[PDB]
Write a protein that binds this ligand. Structure first.
Ligand SMILES: O=P(O)(O)O[C@@H]1[C@@H](O)[C@H](OP(=O)(O)O)[C@@H](OP(=O)(O)O)[C@H](O)[C@H]1OP(=O)(O)O
Ligand SMILES: Nc1ncnc2c1ncn2[C@@H]1O[C@H](COP(=O)(O)OP(=O)(O)O)[C@@H](O)[C@H]1O
Ligand SMILES: [Mg+2]
Length: 216
């Protein structure tokens, strides 16, 4: 009847679709997430097609969303909060890693405020599952940098406050496939300008991933 989806973070009710390639996310507090998917659809559809999982439909208070892990034999997922936290500062200055596949094995704690050294160590930990082929993990890093670059650029021209949004980084164990997409629009707001805080999260991640893709 109901199979629970293996979340990396969040407090939200998320189940598998009755059907392949679909997850059902429940809207707990308001329909704001739906209102914002539709607004972005009308005003920024290029942003929606490039960076955001497809919304196939709504069923009462459930959003039917593209399952970003679906085309992967052995997905490694990392959730990074790049939007403002409701309250509390980011655990890594410009962003907060909310969790990652096998984070329990490295004693990762989402409440622990981290140095740059710990932050980078946690991202190296997340890449461990991708194995010792060094010239193949850096292909993963570089494809991530390519899309995060275009995202940061595109964010300059979008008049939204991306409160609460996360990046979902995914890579297959064999490193043949990867992607990153923006999720969680529940707390996003219209504003008269662009979101310098959310841009500074993306550019900082670009810096960190770039240092990883270049250290020998
Ligand atoms: O709805 P809840 O259970 O109170 O928790 C949300 C929670 O969903 C969110 O974290 P994440 O789940 O997107 O990682 C928290 O985000 P912050 O990291 O920005 O604090 C929210 O703060 C929680 O909502 P609230 O602050 O209303 O409890
Ligand atoms: N479309 C998606 N495909 C796959 N996993 C997803 C998708 N959307 C969310 N997730 C998973 O759900 C978690 C929380 O989703 P999110 O939208 O941030 O919900 P919450 O409001 O609970 O924080 C992420 O950490 C990720 O593991
Ligand atoms: Mg979230």
């Amino acid at each position: 009847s109901i199979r629970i989806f293996p979340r990396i973070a969040g407090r939200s009710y998320i189940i598998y679709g009755q059907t392949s390639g679909i997850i059902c996310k429940r809207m707990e507090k308001s329909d704001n997430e739906f209102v914002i998917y539709n607004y972005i659809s009308e005003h920024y559809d290029k942003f929606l097609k490039k960076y955001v999982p497809k919304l196939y439909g709504k069923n009462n208070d459930m959003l039917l969303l593209e399952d970003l892990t679906y085309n992967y034999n052995n997905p490694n997922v990392m959730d990074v909060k790049i939007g403002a936290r409701k309250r509390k500062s980011h655990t890594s200055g410009f962003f907060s890693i909310r969790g990652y596949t096998n984070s329990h094995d490295y004693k990762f704690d989402p409440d622990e405020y981290l140095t740059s050294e710990s932050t980078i160590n946690h991202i190296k930990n997340f890449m461990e599952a991708g194995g010792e082929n060094r010239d193949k993990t850096k292909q993963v890093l570089l494809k991530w940098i390519m899309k995060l670059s275009e995202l940061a650029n595109d964010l300059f021209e979008i008049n939204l406050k991306f409160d609460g949004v996360s990046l979902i980084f995914i890579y297959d164990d064999d490193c043949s496939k990867c992607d990153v997409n923006v999720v969680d629009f529940s707390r996003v707001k219209l504003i008269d300008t662009n979101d310098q805080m959310t841009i500074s999260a993306v550019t900082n991640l670009i810096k960190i991933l770039s240092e990883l893709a270049d250290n020998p």
